[PDB]
Design a protein around this ligand. Structure first.
Ligand SMILES: CCCCCCCCCC
Ligand SMILES: CCCCCCCCCC
Ligand SMILES: CCCCCCCCCC
Ligand SMILES: CCCCCCCCCC
Ligand SMILES: CCCCCCCCCC
Ligand SMILES: CCCCCCCCCC
Ligand SMILES: CCCCCCCCCC
Ligand SMILES: CCCCCCCCCC
Ligand SMILES: [K+]
Ligand SMILES: [K+]
Ligand SMILES: [K+]
Ligand SMILES: [K+]
Ligand SMILES: [K+]
Ligand SMILES: [K+]
Lengths: 268, 282
């Protein structure tokens, strides 16, 4: 009978409004400057080049906009990488089907692909989930039977998972992307988190930005994605579980606050 | 006994892993076979337009000309209106557009049509998704539970009406699953896609292609219901993310059903291979 959805809905709508205000506060400033720095650039080109005028430039800019539709791509290895983004749902979009057929196939390819991949990822996670189990198996004896009791060890263990997991699937792959791909420390981490969360803006793509890389680099990447996605899968789930606790902790802390405020009121 | 099943599990993953490689391989061939041809006609016709400009303007920055385009495309990664006229640009990070941005973040769609360029917006976006995505999962879960019972009530009315003599519980379930996909593809695919056709000016395929890519949490960003400037009554964009909310809940089950069907065929093909193994002309 009880809905319980509206409350979570509003928290989400609230979580969005807070986000919106923070993003425009952070991004719109640099927007304006770049939007001014772009105006300075057009006039510079027309002034520095009597060869070009208002008429020629408008025509040029319009064709480069048409180039935005496309930008060799769709090669033997790119389309394979494309299909990867589809079944995983990341969908960087940097390369997408421009053919009515490539779209219909993409539609069919996704409806069938996504469910398929889930089975693989489901097994990949299950497999690594037990691998982690073996690792923490010897960790639950050495310094567990010793001083600290069992109820509080469950925290030390979870910290080892995130700490260690963030190194293998976040730190190391970001460090490699930094050198090989030429990205910064934040951009690398930014890419990893955006990629392994299946968001995939497409602003940063390890396969893209090509003047430098080898066919050994790109396979290990998609495998990284395969394995890393399972990591955030549990990480995202745990973070989701932490919220469930805080949701009940706050729900009983609010019950505490009236129970004592009611007490307090009845004194006269 | 404990390790015996582990041995049996890895055997399943590996086979599925190899099936995934084939599916991608078969996909890569189908895409590059479809897309690369038109990529060539454009890749060559773009050199023609440069030739119609390079030689048409010898006084141009011929070697430096490509440096200009680089800055344009470098600006193309962000919303740009760099023309002689329309020097008054529109903000992609205004009060309303960033809200839509956060909606794409917590739902993992990530159209990428607008992404943060600030070290803060990035360090915020990361923290925002780590906590946001799980949060949205609860919403979509309840939204599914809620809409799932709205179907339970309506399915009860239709199942008893079709109740006749010699009704078979096992075979009646099929009738219900069809009507689910029927109204589902109407309310969340057909209807909202037709509206996008007229409001967004998108073609027939571009609408359904958009609905699918969006509600399958892929979101290439090639098409977005709130990307352009056209008029956007602002009674349109709000209904968009809502549809996304419930539409996501829909494909959540649709995609989940397909996986079920795939796992049925996975058995039937696995035993059909055992039959052909067995007999194959005695
Ligand atoms: C970041 C958004 C946090 C909003 C908390 C709302 C709490 C409502 C009391 C149940
Ligand atoms: C799978 C059905 C696709 C038709 C367009
Ligand atoms: C990257 C970690 C692979 C599993 C050991
Ligand atoms: C280059 C340093 C990037 C640090 C990102 C970590 C943000 C905190 C996430 C909780
Ligand atoms: C740091 C913001 C975490 C938001 C917690 C949400 C509280 C749930 C209230 C029901
Ligand atoms: C893309 C999958 C083509 C069909 C493969 C059938 C299963 C192979 C194992 C027998
Ligand atoms: C957009 C259709 C939603 C109906 C519930
Ligand atoms: C186009 C048919 C797709 C069905 C694939 C069957 C996979 C069987 C794996 C055992
Ligand atoms: K893009
Ligand atoms: K996703
Ligand atoms: K996800
Ligand atoms: K995306
Ligand atoms: K995505
Ligand atoms: K994208």
């Amino acid at each position: 009978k009880w809905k319980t959805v509206s409350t979570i809905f509003l928290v989400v709508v609230l979580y969005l409004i807070i986000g919106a205000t923070v993003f425009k506060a952070l991004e719109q400033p640099q927007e304006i400057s770049q939007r001014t720095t772009i105006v300075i650039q057009r006039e510079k080109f027309l002034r520095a080049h009597p060869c070009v005028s208002d008429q020629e430039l408008d025509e040029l800019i319009q064709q480069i906009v048409a180039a935005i539709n496309a930008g060799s791509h769709w090669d033997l290895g790119s389309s394979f990488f494309f299909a990867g983004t589809v079944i995983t749902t990341i969908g960087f979009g940097n390369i997408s089907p421009r053919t009515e057929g490539g779209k219909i196939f993409c539609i069919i390819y996704a409806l069938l692909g996504i469910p398929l991949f889930g089975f693989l990822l489901a097994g990949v996670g299950d497999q690594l989930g037990t691998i982690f189990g073996k690792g923490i198996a010897k960790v639950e004896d050495t310094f567990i039977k010793w001083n600290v009791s069992q109820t509080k060890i469950r925290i030390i263990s979870t910290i080892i998972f995130i700490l260690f997991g963030c190194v293998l699937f976040v730190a190391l792959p970001a460090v490699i992307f930094k050198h090989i791909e030429g990205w910064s420390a934040l951009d690398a981490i930014y890419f990893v988190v955006i990629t392994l969360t299946t968001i995939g803006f497409g602003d940063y793509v390890a396969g893209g930005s090509d003047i430098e890389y080898l066919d050994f680099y790109k396979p290990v990447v998609w495998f990284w994605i395969l394995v890393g996605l399972a990591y955030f899968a549990a990480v995202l789930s745990m973070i989701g579980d932490w919220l469930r606790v805080i949701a009940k902790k706050t729900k009983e802390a609010v019950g505490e606050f009236r129970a004592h405020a009611a007490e307090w009121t009845a004194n006269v």
